[PDB]
Every structure is written in structure tokens, then in C-alpha cells.
Design an enzyme around this catalytic site. Structure first.
Site, PDB file in Angstrom:
ATOM      1  N   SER A 126      17.388 103.439 -43.077  1.00  0.00           N
ATOM      2  CA  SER A 126      16.270 104.319 -42.618  1.00  0.00           C
ATOM      3  C   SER A 126      15.909 105.733 -43.642  1.00  0.00           C
ATOM      4  CB  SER A 126      16.465 104.849 -41.402  1.00  0.00           C
ATOM      5  OG  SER A 126      15.143 104.944 -40.580  1.00  0.00           O
ATOM      6  N   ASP A 164      12.525  95.622 -35.383  1.00  0.00           N
ATOM      7  CA  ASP A 164      12.635  96.815 -35.529  1.00  0.00           C
ATOM      8  C   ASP A 164      11.363  97.605 -35.013  1.00  0.00           C
ATOM      9  OD1 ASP A 164      12.697  99.538 -36.848  1.00  0.00           O
ATOM     10  OD2 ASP A 164      14.222  98.986 -38.255  1.00  0.00           O
ATOM     11  N   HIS A 171      16.684  98.326 -35.219  1.00  0.00           N
ATOM     12  CA  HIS A 171      17.054  99.212 -36.184  1.00  0.00           C
ATOM     13  C   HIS A 171      18.603  99.879 -36.203  1.00  0.00           C
ATOM     14  CE1 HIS A 171      14.986 102.434 -39.089  1.00  0.00           C
ATOM     15  NE2 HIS A 171      15.972 103.336 -38.195  1.00  0.00           N
TER      16      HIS A 171
HETATM   17 BR   LIG Z   1      16.615 107.224 -39.869  1.00  0.00          BR
END
Ligand SMILES: [Br-]
Length: 277
Positions: A147, A223, A256
Site C-alpha cells: 500500500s 481488495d 488488502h
Molecule cells: Br497503506
């Protein structure tokens, strides 16, 4: 100037956490390292720098990614810095997506952030110098992240092609100038001149690259941030427009979280091992 805070044996090697006074960040910083069994023999090992995402400390990956078993087998050290400067002497925000746990791996130019938020200089310049002077490591390094950290790894590799042998990411923010997480952070850290944001956007950098670092990106199809924050298709477009050596893999059902990361982190280690050696 340097304090070893913890030491935990892990798959025959050692997870160790440190605190030190950072000159680039002007504050106390924490990082963690995993030293494989090979490091105890006299041998020098390569280093994979792992950059974590929003709200993470230097420990999340070490504790949850399950990278140690294969790192030990491959003889790779992993270094995980914190995601921002920390402390009551360092500016913060109440939001999870700004301030501490959210440095975005940029060099902030705007008050009050510019006083301590020099995370780009930290990861690129200070940290590697410290690591190489402390530990039995070679000058072979690679970089990876998740991320905000995937954004970190890609941008840093793209901007420093001769320094990193390979780069990979899980669920990176590929086009930060075009998503709320990136726009909020850049506006705060870098100011309203969107021209200054360009050198911190992996997709723009990939379009502009003159030198290539082999890239592997994994994205979970389940995600929840995919369309609004992450935009893997934009990274694919950038790569196709500039002959970029990117492999981007999409995984049905995966999200995620570190459950996704742990499920594929071994592929990343083998990938990096290929180029580190
Ligand atoms: Br993140």
C-alpha cells in the site's frame, strides 16, 4: 546514538529491533531487522528493505508476513523501518491517513511537517548507510512494500535504479496524485503546487523511467481500496507505454490484509533473491 531494544530468535536467525537518533528526521526512529542464520557464520548477506503501509510500525511485517522461514533458507536480511517519525516532539494528525503511521515516504516541504517528515531521505540515504555499517551485509539491496509502502518501494526504486536490484509490492498506491489518500497526504506534506507531487507518483515515474528495475506487483481482487486508492490498471498502462519490466498479478478472493501478503510473500523473496545474488 543506537540501542538494541529486543532480540527474538526466529527460524534459527534473529529478529532485532533498534532505536537510533536519525539525522535526516531529527528524532528517535525505530527499525527492525531480520538476520538469517547465514549472518551468524561470518558470511555477508543481501538486504531487502520492506516498507509498510498506513498505521503500521516497524513490527507489523516482521510479526505477520511470515517471511522469516524462507528468508532464512535463502540467506536474505530484511530491514523494516517505521512508517514515519514518532513522538510527542513530532507533528501528528488524528486521522489514520496523515501524520504518524503515515509519512508517505516523501520529503515534506510544508510546516509543520517539514521539521521531521523526511522519510524519503531516511529510507534512501540514512537507513542503508546505518544498516551497512552495523550488520554483516553486502551492498546488494532490493526494496518492497504494501500500500502506502508499495507506493514507497516503487517510487524509491524508480528514482534510484542503480541502488536497487529489484522491487516488488503488494497492493501499492500506484497513482497517488489521483486518489484521496495521496491527495490528502501530498497537499499536507508538499503543498498545493501539484507539480511537486509528480516525483512521488509511481505511475508517472514509471512512464518517465530511463533505467529499469525489474518489478513484481501482487494485487488482491477482493481488495476494497482497489479502484479508489490503488489503481493497478494505471500501473499496467504506464509499464506498457515505456517498455517497463513489470509483472502484475491479480488474485481472486484475496484482500488488502497481511493474510494476502503472507500468502504470496515467498514468491517475492524468491524474486528478490534472483536479483540480489
Ligand atoms: Br497503506
Amino acid at each position: 546514538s543506537i540501542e538494541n531494544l529486543s532480540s527474538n530468535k526466529s527460524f534459527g536467525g534473529w529478529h532485532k529491533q533498534y532505536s537510533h537518533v536519525s539525522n535526516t528526521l531529527n528524532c528517535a526512529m525505530r527499525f527492525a531487522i531480520y538476520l538469517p542464520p547465514q549472518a551468524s557464520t561470518g558470511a555477508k548477506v543481501p538486504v531487502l528493505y520492506w516498507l509498510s503501509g498506513l498505521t503500521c510500525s516497524d513490527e507489523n511485517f516482521m510479526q505477520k508476513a511470515g517471511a522469516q522461514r524462507l528468508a532464512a533458507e535463502l540467506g536474505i536480511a530484511i530491514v523494516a523501518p517505521d512508517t514515519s517519525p514518532r513522538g510527542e516532539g513530532v507533528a501528528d494528525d488524528e486521522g489514520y491517513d496523515l501524520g504518524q503511521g503515515a509519512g508517505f515516504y516523501v520529503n515534506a516541504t510544508q510546516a509543520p511537517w517539514n521539521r521531521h517528515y523526511q522519510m524519503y531521505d531516511y529510507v534512501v540515504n540514512e537507513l542503508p548507510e546505518l544498516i551497512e555499517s552495523m550488520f554483516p551485509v553486502s551492498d546488494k539491496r532490493a526494496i518492497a512494500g504494501h500500500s502506502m509502502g508499495g507506493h514507497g518501494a516503487l517510487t524509491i526504486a524508480l528514482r534510484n535504479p542503480e541502488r536497487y536490484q529489484s522491487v516488488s509490492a503488494f497492493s501499492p498506491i500506484n497513482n497517488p496524485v489521483n486518489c484521496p489518500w495521496g491527495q490528502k497526504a501530498f497537499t499536507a506534506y508538499l503543498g498545493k503546487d501539484t507539480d511537486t507531487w509528480r516525483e512521488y507518483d509511481a505511475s508517472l515515474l514509471m512512464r518517465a523511467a530511463k533505467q529499469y528495475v525489474p518489478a513484481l506487483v501482487d494485487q488482491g481482487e477482493a481488495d476494497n481500496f482497489l479502484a479508489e486508492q490503488l489503481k493497478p490498471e494505471v500501473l499496467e498502462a504506464a509499464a506498457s507505454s515505456n517498455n517497463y519490466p513489470l509483472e502484475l498479478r491479480s488474485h481472486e478472493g484475496y484482500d488488502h490484509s497481511y493474510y494476502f501478503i503472507a500468502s504470496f510473500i515467498e514468491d517475492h523473496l524468491r524474486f528478490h533473491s534472483n536479483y540480489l545474488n
